[PDB]
Amino acid sequence: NSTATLCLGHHAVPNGTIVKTITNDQIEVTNATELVQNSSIGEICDSPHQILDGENCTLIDALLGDPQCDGFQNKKWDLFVERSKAYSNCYPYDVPDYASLRSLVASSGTLEFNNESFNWTGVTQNGTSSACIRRSNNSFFSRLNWLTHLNFKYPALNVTMPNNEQFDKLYIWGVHHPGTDKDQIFLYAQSSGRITVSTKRSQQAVIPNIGSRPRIRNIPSRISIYWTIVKPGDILLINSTGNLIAPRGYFKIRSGKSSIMRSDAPIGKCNSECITPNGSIPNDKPFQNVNRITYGACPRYVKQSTLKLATGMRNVPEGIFGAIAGFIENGWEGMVDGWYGFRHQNSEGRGQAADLKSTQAAIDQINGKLNRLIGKTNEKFHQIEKEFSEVEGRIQDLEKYVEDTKIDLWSYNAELLVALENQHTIDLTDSEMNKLFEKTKKQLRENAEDMGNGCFKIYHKCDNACIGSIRNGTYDHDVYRDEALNNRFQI
Amino acid sequence: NSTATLCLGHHAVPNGTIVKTITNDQIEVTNATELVQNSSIGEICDSPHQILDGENCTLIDALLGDPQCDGFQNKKWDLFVERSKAYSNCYPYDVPDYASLRSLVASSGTLEFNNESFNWTGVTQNGTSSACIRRSNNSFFSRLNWLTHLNFKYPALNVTMPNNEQFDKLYIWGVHHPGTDKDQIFLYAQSSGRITVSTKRSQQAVIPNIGSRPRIRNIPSRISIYWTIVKPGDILLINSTGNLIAPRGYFKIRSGKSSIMRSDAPIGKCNSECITPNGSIPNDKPFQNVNRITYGACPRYVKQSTLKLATGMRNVPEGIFGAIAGFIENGWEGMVDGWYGFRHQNSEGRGQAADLKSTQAAIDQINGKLNRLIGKTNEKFHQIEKEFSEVEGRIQDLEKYVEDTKIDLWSYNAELLVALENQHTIDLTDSEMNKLFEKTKKQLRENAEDMGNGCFKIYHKCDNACIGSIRNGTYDHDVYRDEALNNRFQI
Amino acid sequence: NSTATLCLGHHAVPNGTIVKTITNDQIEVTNATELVQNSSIGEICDSPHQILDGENCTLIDALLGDPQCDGFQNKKWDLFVERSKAYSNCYPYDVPDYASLRSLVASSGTLEFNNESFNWTGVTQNGTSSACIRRSNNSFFSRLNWLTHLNFKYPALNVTMPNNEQFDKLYIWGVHHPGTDKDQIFLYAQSSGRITVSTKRSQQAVIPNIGSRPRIRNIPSRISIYWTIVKPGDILLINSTGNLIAPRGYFKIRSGKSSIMRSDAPIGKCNSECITPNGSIPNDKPFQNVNRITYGACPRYVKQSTLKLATGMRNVPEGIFGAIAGFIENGWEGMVDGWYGFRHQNSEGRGQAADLKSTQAAIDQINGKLNRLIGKTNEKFHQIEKEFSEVEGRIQDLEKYVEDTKIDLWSYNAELLVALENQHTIDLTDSEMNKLFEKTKKQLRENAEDMGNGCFKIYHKCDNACIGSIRNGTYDHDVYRDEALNNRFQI
Numbered sequence A, B, C: 001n002s003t004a005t006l007c008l009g010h011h012a013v014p015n016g017t018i019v020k021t022i023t024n025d026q027i028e029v030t031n032a033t034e035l036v037q038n039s040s041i042g043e044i045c046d047s048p049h050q051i052l053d054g055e056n057c058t059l060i061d062a063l064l065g066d067p068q069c070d071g072f073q074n075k076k077w078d079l080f081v082e083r084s085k086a087y088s089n090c091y092p093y094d095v096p097d098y099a100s101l102r103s104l105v106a107s108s109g110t111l112e113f114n115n116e117s118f119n120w121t122g123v124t125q126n127g128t129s130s131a132c133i134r135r136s137n138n139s140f141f142s143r144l145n146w147l148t149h150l151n152f153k154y155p156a157l158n159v160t161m162p163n164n165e166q167f168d169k170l171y172i173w174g175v176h177h178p179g180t181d182k183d184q185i186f187l188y189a190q191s192s193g194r195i196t197v198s199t200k201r202s203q204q205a206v207i208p209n210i211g212s213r214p215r216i217r218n219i220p221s222r223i224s225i226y227w228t229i230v231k232p233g234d235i236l237l238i239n240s241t242g243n244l245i246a247p248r249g250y251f252k253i254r255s256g257k258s259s260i261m262r263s264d265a266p267i268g269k270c271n272s273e274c275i276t277p278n279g280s281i282p283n284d285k286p287f288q289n290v291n292r293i294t295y296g297a298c299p300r301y302v303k304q305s306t307l308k309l310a311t312g313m314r315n316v317p318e319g320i321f322g323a324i325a326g327f328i329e330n331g332w333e334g335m336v337d338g339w340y341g342f343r344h345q346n347s348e349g350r351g352q353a354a355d356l357k358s359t360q361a362a363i364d365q366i367n368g369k370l371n372r373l374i375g376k377t378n379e380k381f382h383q384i385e386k387e388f389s390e391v392e393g394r395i396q397d398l399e400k401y402v403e404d405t406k407i408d409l410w411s412y413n414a415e416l417l418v419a420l421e422n423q424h425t426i427d428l429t430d431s432e433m434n435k436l437f438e439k440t441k442k443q444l445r446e447n448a449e450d451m452g453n454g455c456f457k458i459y460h461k462c463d464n465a466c467i468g469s470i471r472n473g474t475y476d477h478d479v480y481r482d483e484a485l486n487n488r489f490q491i
Ligand SMILES: *[C@@H]1O[C@H](CO)[C@@H](O[C@@H]2O[C@H](CO)[C@@H](O)[C@H](O)[C@H]2NC(C)=O)[C@H](O)[C@H]1NC(C)=O
Pocket: A212, A213, A214, A215, A220, B158, B159, B160, B235
């Protein structure tokens, strides 16, 4: 009672969280934050990216001009969304390397089309069918021109169209494969048929194939679709002795941030930077477990469902420096205004006060980690396909392998980051506790002794103002030294 | 002699191991463990994966039905093993995109075949050759049906087969290329020949090519092999005016964990999760240097031949805290029952005792690292090919680049992991030593002084029970304080 | 004045550098080094790699034998450099899968050509044109043999050439597509034309296409180029009924470290291991921001423009241990012969001296980090293409995705490495300061007291030799103990 006690300590909470570190799979800290985004709100937000809902139409069908897709003429998009309900309702067609055409168009992000005046002297234009009805009338693909004989003759065509512009031109055309020799004659007079379209730097030579195929909406014939790009100063050359499905012009082709995504999520009236096929997701977290397919500023896809980053010290209710969960037996749940602090006992009673500077020092370092990790995602736009509806073999094997490789490496980075950061967070918080203890010890000089549990026995009368002077660094040890020494070194 | 000495210390071994850290390329620790698996037992274990030894047959030959491979009918596998000795002994064939067909079949993991009753009215079935002898008789591919003229005529075929099942069907067929017009007439009556097989969603149009090729086992003609997949509700349509090598049904196609591997390792009667072409390897280590080609739960392939993870403190015979290899001059090889401990000298003699708690604290942390690294490998099944027998160019360049990229990134992860873990292991062991020293110092209060080399000079008579009381935390400093103070502060 | 003062401290500089750590985006250290190479000297050094400047010729043109490229016959290279100014000046040609042929040749690294004596009995050899003028004379591709009719007939050819060597043979050949039926007859007599070349393991069947294409240097006809590889014991078989552009032999095909690069950088007379299209770059740094396209021992491409690795302690003008920027208020700019040291005040004056051992300990650890990072780059040769002149779709998407994936992962590794190393460097330097302080404290025993700011109050007369004895570890505390104790414990 001619003495006082000053104890150094740290806070603790009743509701701790378990995190992983380098040396321990399960250790409890006072607080943590989730680094893996695991949920979507179920909608694709129409902002801030220009969304184009394909609805009943695939991109290709909108490109070709299926009457159902007339409203899509000359549209632009950041992201084209293909629905699973979609279907074609015009003339049956196939595209060799469909995926590549779909990709380059999607990446271009526009359906801007210019009509071109080709000299088709000698044939009947605007061919038409009952499988492709527009406004209740028999029609055809809006961007394609079906040619037939004129007066039972089909001369050889030798048509050119030069690109005298500053931009590339994208031409879409096709070859008809009638189901019967009868039809071949009826349409084109000739028995054979042959198409050759060229530029200075390419030749595409197609020979049509008469034959029956299983009927799609009761049609056994097919059209095969092809494309060719013509650059400034180059020229398109179309030769045909029949069966040519002609273009009515070219598509502009651009480069930018545009792409395409398969999803059934409804479009919402909302704003979100990151889009997945499950719907838009927040991008505050550095990682996500929602979908490997993303568009925009998105967290990186990892395999883990959860990864907790410690944002507080080790929770000890009741480190390398050995203070927290070391020589300090437990934390103080009763300390709610700081992370580290002082408890005392003197002649005037018992008290508790937080230390702000040490509290702030730990908090600043932890916020430093958060700033490196939170709200710093990276933009990706058109990528590769990551889900497949048909077996393809070699190329699909490679595409799958590349993505699986990427995911495991990022999943590794995420796991290690958290383990390392959490080990370091537990150690830096232990460190700040030790620094405060060490500083206090030096302040007291020869006037106190370390009891070994974070507490100092102060060998002199130390009232509330004295204790306060210790806590704010104005304690003058020389004032009490004589009193303390006599108390310390007696019998 | 009115005094005692208590020294704090750590163990050391005569046989240390050199490891790498962040700051030092070569530092000696008491013990380490190897993280890179560098050897195989030379056999492929037949457990726990269903192994199928191709022996003399490639997967394709077993698929087609080379008589040599009759025993493989309807087999399933987790892993198909292709031998280098393998060879074909039927009709000479090629497969365009051989690699893709090989892959999809291998990935499917089954040769389950259902026979289908096609209406081949108008032709001769079960064509046969002297190049493909079965049971000493001239025969053909068991799954293929070679059609020829009936009564010197070959009408146009228009055969359909609908998929009215719940699963996909895999059809294998082929086109014959006779070496002579003479043979073309003899077999098919017609001079030309043409094959067209279709579904609702595809057309494969082949035009046979009469001509001579270098003779394979004395045959100058060839067959080209093709495949088509037919889904539920779709239909196969086969049109031919000759040369058609017909299917006798379909293969079931599955999806799962199946794959194929090229190896000459014998199959052993043993159990091992990880398979390489060199043979099975243990998967206790996180990394391996045996082969980039793996199947099953395998360690990851890295370029390093060795990577030592420290599992013990720095070995000092004769860290950031400066105790081990610091103010403590060297370790004690004579301490074999603990990592840290006490040596004393008093009136009753000289002694040594291990400290269990500090020893266990270091060991637990090191075992924590091991648990994160040991026995946690990840399963991979069908991947991409990683060795190539022919020059192919672009696609092979990409396949090689992808794998080389993956390997360097994992090799980087492995090198950094070990360097970081070892720096941390050396530091945590130094830390535990410092904690024990610090705790002991506080226990002694004013009764001892730090001699600066890990030893305390105790300023009072301290017999074996006294020393023991210090080592187990029951030392009451107040009992000796008067004696110690008088000895300390004298002239 | 019956007392002395000894202060422990560290250096500081007027010109600090800002680096990144784990907990702080901007912290100042005494010195740092740049890890990202950001510049080129603008030239491609001709050493130590064998450089081949294509000049006006592409690799393919040098392969085929455009007269402009005659000087390139049988050349070898480590790296072939294609200029953008390059152009073809012979017969107009295309190569299907041009990129793959370009790649395999570049990777082979040689134009070594052996002439072979084919039996072309029945046709006219050495066909020639006005589009391909050699020495002012009409000529053709030096490695190709243009065949025409002899006496208005073109019989069927059935020529073989066996590989009875120990190495592979690379055959280059072509198919002519005349612009008119008139030309077809004039050259080959026959109206059709057909080419079939085979080995035991392959068939390439081409059917020429008569037709007009936009004129290249006033030629509307084209040649299509093809290749086939023939292995030891295999045989080439060439069948043609016209239009065959024949080979005059084979190219040797090798495997090794050869590749090709597109660049307009001039070749310099200098020595540098790493080549980019911007020019050669030094490879002392582990990372570079110059170009994703590299050849040789090169730093890895990252997205960051700068990454500073700390090579010195925290700069404090005027850590986890709390010494530097902690209880030691600031550094000493006046200390230029060491990183850590002593300042004293006694009866003889005031002094400063560096401590070498602690200085060297920090420096050695930092040099350890540098040795792991500096001058350890890895060799890469032929890779994949990373810039593209035409839209291609699927395969190009994959090639771009693979490279973008690789770059982000390395950029991540680089950012984390630096943040981790810098946090550790700041901590280890703080640690060495603390060790020196701790060691000094123990030396002084009961003869001094810690003033809490790195300074000791020494309670006895301590002249220059005494202070010196403290700095070099020969201070005998027992000599001054009586004097110090009486001064310490008085009233
Ligand atoms: C080849 O066979 C198919 C299948 O029998 C024929 O296609 C059918 O034609 C009938 C009428 O001719 C239609 O009612 C069916 O819907 C068709 N089925 C399919 C799957 O398309 C086809 O006409 C035959 N080819 C020839 C030339 O006769």
